């Protein structure tokens, strides 16, 4: 007999890495980039019911070891074919959110397998990393192509330095980042957007009605904070103000994640005086913290290219190569 088997997105057969909101109909909604949902199945066809809030969100779909397929999701619910073969076999399926919150939020409602069964969920690594930051952490402009107007297709989470670093360290990762945002102000000088200490609390979104992320749902071994580019965009911010708020934020992290090691870094975009100032502010933050759980990693500036100052795909690869060795020493993950 031919049979189908449909499960909700929130079902134990679907592995989830990254922040998701569980809706009352057992669908999952997510906004941060890098959110990864995976399943292993025995069958010939697998489809998903998906939608995005603004029709401006992208995902990657990876079947077994094949090249990924990037798909832009319509604002209306649509059946998305993940794979289809003439015969049944065992297949691994991964969906990766490429977009970030301002692009919209994506919802996966349910999956339908034509075949025999969903197998046990893919097993994730034991090690867990959380990366906090701005659009560089979010993977903005990694997939740029010369000649195109920037659009939401340019974002790539899998090839961002945070995901490459986690992969090298055999670790899970959550990316909690928002383009244009800072620790205390946005690139445009505005101080009353949700800053990093605000959106760090949200499962997705950033309005008065954004759902609170329960930290018990992901307790990282390592937290990297790479925030700062946008705080320095208008000019170098006031030293006491910045250091006092960075200190207060890392105190929140330390208290929320009692087992975590925290690594602060200025990121790749700032250069020259602005870079040196943020490095300085980080050193003084650490001095005020007096914590044997808080460390620093140095990094190079990467200039982007003629089309966009955001670091390129090859620069993100370089960034992971520079950061990873320092993280091994800090975490004793000499692996």
Residue numbers in the entry: 7 to 341
What does the paper say about this structure?
CE2 enzymes are acetyl esterases (that are generally not appended to other catalytic modules), which are reported to be active on synthetic aryl-esters and acetylated xylan. Here we report the biochemical properties and crystal structure of several CE2 members, both single-module CE2 enzymes and CtCE2, a component of CtCel5C-CE2. All three 3D structures reveal a bi-domain enzyme in which an N-terminal β-sheet “jelly roll” domain (around 130 residues) is linked to a C-terminal domain of approximately 220 residues. The C-terminal domains possess an atypical α/β-hydrolase (SGNH-hydrolase) fold, consisting of repeating β-α-β motifs that form a curved central five-stranded parallel β-sheet, in the strand order β2, β1, β3, β4, and β5 with strand β2 interrupted by loop insertion.
CjCE2A is a canonical serine hydrolase, with a classical Ser-His-Asp triad, in which Ser-160 is the catalytic nucleophile, His-335 activates the serine, and Asp-333 makes a hydrogen bond with Nδ1 of His-335 thus completing the catalytic triad. The oxyanion hole, which stabilises the incipient tetrahedral transition-state, comprise the N of Ser-160 and Gly-205 and the Nδ2 of Asn-255. Indeed, in the pocket within the cleft of CjCE2A is a formate molecule, mimicking the reactive intermediate, which makes hydrogen bonds with the residues that form the oxyanion hole. Based on their catalytic efficiencies, CtCE2 and CjCE2B exhibit a significant preference for acetylated glucomannan over xylan, whereas CjCE2A and CjCE2C do not distinguish between the two polysaccharides. Pull-down assays revealed that none of the Cellvibrio enzymes bound to insoluble cellulose. Although the two structurally characterised Cellvibrio esterases do not bind cellohexaose or cellulose, they do contain aromatic residues in the cleft that houses the active site. Thus, Tyr-665 in CtCE2 is conserved in the C. japonicus esterases (Trp-231 in CjCE2A and Tyr-206 in CjCE2B), while Trp-335 in CjCE2B is equivalent to Trp-790 in the Clostridium enzyme. To address this issue Tyr-683 and Trp-127, which are located in or at the interface, of the CBM-like domains of CtCE2 and CjCE2A, respectively, were mutated and the activities of the two esterase variants were assessed. It would appear, therefore, that the CBM-like domain contributes to substrate recognition in CjCE2A, but its role in the catalytic activity of CtCE2 is less evident.
